Design an enzyme around this catalytic site. Structure first.
Site, PDB file in Angstrom:
ATOM      1  N   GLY A  28       0.934  -1.185  -0.046  1.00  0.00           N
ATOM      2  CA  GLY A  28      -0.133  -0.002   0.096  1.00  0.00           C
ATOM      3  C   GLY A  28       0.789   1.342   0.002  1.00  0.00           C
ATOM      4  O   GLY A  28       2.088   1.301   0.115  1.00  0.00           O
ATOM      5  N   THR A  30       1.449   3.867   2.017  1.00  0.00           N
ATOM      6  CA  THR A  30       2.107   4.084   2.999  1.00  0.00           C
ATOM      7  C   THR A  30       3.415   3.474   3.283  1.00  0.00           C
ATOM      8  O   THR A  30       4.672   3.962   3.580  1.00  0.00           O
ATOM      9  CB  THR A  30       1.376   3.919   4.542  1.00  0.00           C
ATOM     10  OG1 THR A  30       0.030   4.958   4.375  1.00  0.00           O
ATOM     11  CG2 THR A  30       2.217   4.718   5.775  1.00  0.00           C
ATOM     12  N   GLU A 102      -0.515 -10.765   3.420  1.00  0.00           N
ATOM     13  CA  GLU A 102      -0.311  -9.963   4.634  1.00  0.00           C
ATOM     14  C   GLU A 102      -0.599 -10.565   5.954  1.00  0.00           C
ATOM     15  O   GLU A 102       0.481 -10.405   6.954  1.00  0.00           O
ATOM     16  CB  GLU A 102      -1.074  -8.631   4.501  1.00  0.00           C
ATOM     17  CG  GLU A 102      -0.641  -7.729   3.400  1.00  0.00           C
ATOM     18  CD  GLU A 102      -1.663  -6.660   3.198  1.00  0.00           C
ATOM     19  OE1 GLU A 102      -2.922  -6.818   3.821  1.00  0.00           O
ATOM     20  OE2 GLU A 102      -1.658  -5.874   2.260  1.00  0.00           O
TER      21      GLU A 102
END
Ligand code: NA
Ligand code: NA
Lengths: 217, 218
Positions: A28, A30, A102
């Site tokens: 992602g 960030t 993840e």
């Protein structure tokens, strides 16, 4: 400037990276700022484990060595974002469709550092949908089962995960008992994994706002 | 009596439950493959079949039997499949052939699960045959560690890749005292796609072929 906030959170995570560590890396926007920060100290780390094929490509493009999770015995740190996160470290993830690997990497890691800008922080999970990864031939069946759980599943048209599966984004689920919810999704035949992170919590939650980065947890 | 003769008797016993214009869910394995040849004889009376594996799909299509995607089916009256172990309750261990994930999905859409076996598949207590667990490949080492904590001994099925692109850990020595909780405990492991314990989805009928004939164990 949300990008400035994400960069601040990313820089705050770098302070946890010790010499010669293997570092797990999330997915992602960030995390992508964190990857650029990691690039500047790549001489200090052993290698990275990637939670998506996209993340692997970004690490490799920076010349950061990447190793297979199956070869890792000890993974001291995993750094990743979240779509929603609360003070307890419960998260909704999977906005980007990478929630399965993840969760796997997060579960091998000793310390899970969650990096977010202020907008990801919530008092109560649930406004953001729960991505559910589903064996493609099971989509209709799984949708029907999720309806029975009070969810509203919406097929993410055209998208295919790193693992070859489809995503149902599920709205309006109740988060009164988040661990039970996470389990109830995963026991459905055809569900591979779901974006509720209630059994594996963030150990640190670094929250970037105009005034700096605050350790929510 | 050949093993083949027994499987054929069981396959023919299942055909008795097929009605005109049904959509039929079809399992995998050598016993089911004899059923596929029985289905071909009545393929004109069939709407279509749902296939639990790519191999089963290829066998159905080579017989001229229409195949349809499970997502286009909601009313699936029958699912016919074998098992590696089955007991009188209709609990099963499945997945010796590695197709347990699509097998369980189709079985869960189907209303009636007909289990066809020769007598060697019947056990008084499940557990001697290992439990196949389908695993996201990059999670293999982690999942194996988690299974050992549950009291199982996982063995990687070298060289094998499921229809869904995943690997198989064949797990020995698990306790079956609470088989539904066992089935769940495996599946909530991150990286576990599905497992071969069939305790929450039972066989509704168990047709057992022997020298004497076919007996409805259940
Ligand atoms: Na599942
Ligand atoms: Na799982």
């Amino acid at each position: 400037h949300m990008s400035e906030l994400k960069i601040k959170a990313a820089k705050a995570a770098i302070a946890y990276i010790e010499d010669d560590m293997v570092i797990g890396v999330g997915t992602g926007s960030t995390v992508n700022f964190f990857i650029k920060e990691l690039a500047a100290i790549k001489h200090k780390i052993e290698a990275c484990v990637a939670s998506s094929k996209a993340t692997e490509a970004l690490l490799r493009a920076e010349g950061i060595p990447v190793i297979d999770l199956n070869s890792v015995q000890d993974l001291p740190i995993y750094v990743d974002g979240a779509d929603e996160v609360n003070e307890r470290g419960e998260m909704i993830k999977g906005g980007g469709g990478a929630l399965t690997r993840e969760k796997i990497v997060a579960n091998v890691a000793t310390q899970f550092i969650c990096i977010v800008d202020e907008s990801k922080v919530v008092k109560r999970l649930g406004e953001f949908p729960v991505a559910v990864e589903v064996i493609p031939m099971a989509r209709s069946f799984v949708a029907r089962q999720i309806v029975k759980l009070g969810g509203d599943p919406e097929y993410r048209e055209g998208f295919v995960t790193d693992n070859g599966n489809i995503i149902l984004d599920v709205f309006n689920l109740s988060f009164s008992t988040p661990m039970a919810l996470e389990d109830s999704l995963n026991v459905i035949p055809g569900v591979v994994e779901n974006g509720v992170f209630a059994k594996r919590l963030a150990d640190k939650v670094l929250v970037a706002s105009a005034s700096g980065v605050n350790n929510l947890k």
